[PDB]
């Protein structure tokens, strides 16, 4: 595609953002629970 | 075929980011409420 | 079509991310104000 | 129905995310500076 | 014409999000380092 | 030409967001582990 290449890269990067954002959610919930 | 597949994957990943970001918002609001 | 469907889903998810991110900003500002 | 319509909506939502993310950066810097 | 315009706007907004997200990462690392 | 250019720029920016978000996750996990006082 060539156009296709860029879109595939966005797809991959967005998956990595999803995974990292889930870890932030987990860690922020732990912080909230400790802060009482 | 290829652009369609990658776009579907972006859609799925962005939905997962939305869900995780909502949990971060909830947890950060709890932290804010505890700090006062 | 398929690209149309996926693009609509990205649009919806990105709107939800916008809303959640604005709440994170509000809550983080309140945390900053409490920390003096 | 349109790809154009959905893409415009993504554009608008991403601008709102940009604005909110800049506020998170400001507020997180203030928190960091207070934590010494 | 319309898809092109919206895509350019997404590109610009995503660059601004990148810059802000890098600052959040820097500030959060400083918080982590202070918390020992 | 123009759609291609803008899409490449989105790709690059999203990669930078991915890298920064991973660092936020790491740092937030360290904060969580410290708050385990």
């Amino acid at each position: 595609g060539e156009i296709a290449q860029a879109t595939k890269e966005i797809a991959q990067a967005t998956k990595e953002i999803a995974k990292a954002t889930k870890e932030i959610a987990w860690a922020t919930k732990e912080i909230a629970q400790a802060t009482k």
Side-chain angles (χ1 to χ4, degrees), chain A:
Chain A
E2 77 182 43
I3 323 291
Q5 186 46 42
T7 307
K8 282 167 203 162
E9 279 170 11
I10 292 168
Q12 182 51 46
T14 53
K15 286 178 203 195
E16 291 174 20
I17 295 164
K19 186 185 171 206
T21 303
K22 285 177 204 153
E23 295 186 326
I24 294 160
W26 179 85
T28 306
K29 161 176 135 45
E30 297 282 311
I31 294 163
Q33 177 163 18
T35 311
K36 295 294 89 144

